[PDB]
Amino acid sequence: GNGRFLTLKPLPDSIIQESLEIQQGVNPFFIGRSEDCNCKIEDNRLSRVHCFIFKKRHAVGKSMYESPAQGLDDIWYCHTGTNVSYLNNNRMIQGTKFLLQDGDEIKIIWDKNNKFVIGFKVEINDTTGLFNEGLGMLQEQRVVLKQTAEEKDLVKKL
């Protein structure tokens, strides 16, 4: 497991039923109808750079003792699609970032009328020196944040 850290597995319940794994070294992982997206999702509704999972160095609030957390890396899910995505219970519009916890099932597209639903389960097998792995530590904070020029630049690579 010197190449895979995170595992995004499209479930059978979704039009997709494959397993994609982000490499501890691949950051950010791009998702969208365009295979250019490190992750592959073919949904007529999905866009080229539908969304991407980006990794960042988790910063701690100092420590005048011996406590965990420290400074390591965290994986953020960055939605770039107009069709919006659903993560557990948090909405993310094209241009948002989100914390990805170990075993996080994210839905990129859900249509009731079409009965077609897409969702991937994030499973981290390897922890490339991750403060935890991505599920955070103490008081889970699952709130959607906005992206900046840094994020927009990442999608400008493919």
């Binding site: 509704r45 866009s47 107009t82 069709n83 919006v84 597209i109 859900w110 009731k112």
Partner: peptide
């Protein structure tokens, strides 16, 4: 085609 919309 950024004219999509979901319920």
């Amino acid at each position: 085609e950024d004219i999509y919309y979901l319920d």
